[PDB]
């Protein structure tokens, strides 16, 4: 096969909305709903293609309106929080002092709202970190990726700290050399 997916969602009452395109599980792009522009997963894509961002904004409006109708006719049946499965790995075989990257896989969860924080020896890291938006799953739960560029060492100890309504408490995934 080969699958291209146009996925969108709207969450009340957080009023979170998202609109993205997916190819075999990898994000082609998503629309920044505030700047009303297209943000390509890989810089290069924006050179080989284009997209009318405003059009996602039209759909999102419909999506919300639809959400309000459905919410009401299900008798305000709320979503069941499904906690994330969190994993931490490196992008490649780790070698001391050889630049690598820590990937934090937050998978199989819903609703699409989460707080992710990287920790370096009990302290929060900011520099160089990046993250993706919520990605769709066949089971309709979501996946998400957070990254932390780092320089391997024997002393450091990292943690991908994830908070989600499905979790009675912060989940910390440990990673060290």
């Amino acid at each position: 096969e080969h699958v291209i997916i146009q996925a969108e969602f709207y969450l009340n009452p957080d009023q979170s909305g998202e609109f993205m395109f997916d190819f075999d599980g990898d994000e082609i792009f998503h629309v920044d709903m505030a700047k009303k522009e297209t943000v390509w997963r890989l810089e290069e894509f924006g050179r080989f293609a284009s997209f009318e961002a405003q059009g996602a904004l039209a759909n999102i409006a419909v999506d919300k309106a639809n959400l309000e109708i459905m919410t009401k006719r299900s008798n305000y049946t709320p979503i069941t929080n499904v906690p994330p499965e969190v994993t931490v790995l490196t992008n490649s075989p780790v070698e001391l002092r050889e630049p690598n990257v820590l990937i934090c896989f937050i998978d199989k969860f819903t609703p699409p709202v989460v707080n992710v924080t990287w920790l370096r020896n009990g302290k929060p890291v900011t520099t160089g970190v990046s993250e993706t938006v919520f990605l769709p799953r066949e089971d309709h739960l979501f996946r998400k990726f957070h990254y932390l560029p780092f320089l391997p060492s024997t002393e450091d100890v990292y943690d991908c700290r994830v908070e989600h309504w499905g979790l009675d408490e912060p989940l910390l995934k440990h990673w060290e050399f």
């Binding site: 009023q15 909305g17 709903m33 505030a34 009303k36 405003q54 904004l57 039209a58 999102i60 409006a61 419909v62 919300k64 309106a65 309000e68």
Partner: protein
């Protein structure tokens, strides 16, 4: 500090705009949303507020969504009684709610921001064409603290009529910016010409009024600096 004045390379050239200048004129030619003592009644995204403001004129809408620069900004005026003034657009105006038009910023607290007598405040506007003051005039507002947007709009409406600032297809001027000078020496400006290309994106352009910047009517000074292609 204050924003650095623009260098020629910093401003949009109308000669580089292929589209229809009329779509820019449209935003400032006797065109605006105005409401007094109202409170948001809804919100599409965290950063915007929706109000029940009817189109007094041609009854083209009764719902208005104004987008703000961020959430805190929207949280600030969400439950306040406020006044609204700004330039609305319809092309690519979207929101659910629960006719429509959209805009950015334009909100001011109504409580104690008016003049006890229906008294308006005049604000100086000096127009420069090719670095020389050609004409000077004043715009009026009923607010003590007013959005730059409101003054800007009023300034351009005047110039559209008295100097043909914008015409159906193109403008007499090549570049133009409107500079605001606050009594504490702080200044900032807006480009008055559309981005280069063949299509004017009204929504994207108006987004600049995003910050809901306000200034003191009694002490602020406006300067409109224009240029003709050849001189």
């Amino acid at each position: 500090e204050s924003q650095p004045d623009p260098m020629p390379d910093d401003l949009h050239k109308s000669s580089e705009f292929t589209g229809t200048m009329g779509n820019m004129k449209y935003l400032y030619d006797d065109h605006y949303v105005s409401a007094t003592k109202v409170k948001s009644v809804d919100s599409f995204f965290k950063w915007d507020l929706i109000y029940n403001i009817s189109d007094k004129k041609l009854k083209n809408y009764d719902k208005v969504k104004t987008e703000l620069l961020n959430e805190d900004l929207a949280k600030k005026y969400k439950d306040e009684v406020v006044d609204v003034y700004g330039s609305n657009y319809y092309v690519n105006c979207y929101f659910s709610s629960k006719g429509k038009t959209c805009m950015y910023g334009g909100i001011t607290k109504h409580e104690g921001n008016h003049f006890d007598n229906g008294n308006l405040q005049n604000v100086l506007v000096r127009v420069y064409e090719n670095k020389r003051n050609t004409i000077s005039f004043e715009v009026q507002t009923d607010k003590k603290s007013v959005t730059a947007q409101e003054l800007d709009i009023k300034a351009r409406n005047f110039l559209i009529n008295k100097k043909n600032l914008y015409e159906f297809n193109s403008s007499p001027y090549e570049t133009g910016y409107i500079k605001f000078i606050e009594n504490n020496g702080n200044t900032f400006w807006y480009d008055m010409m559309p981005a280069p290309g063949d299509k004017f994106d009204q929504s994207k352009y108006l987004m600049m009024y995003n910050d809901n910047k306000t200034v003191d009517s009694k002490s602020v000074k406006i300067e409109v600096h224009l240029t003709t292609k050849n001189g």
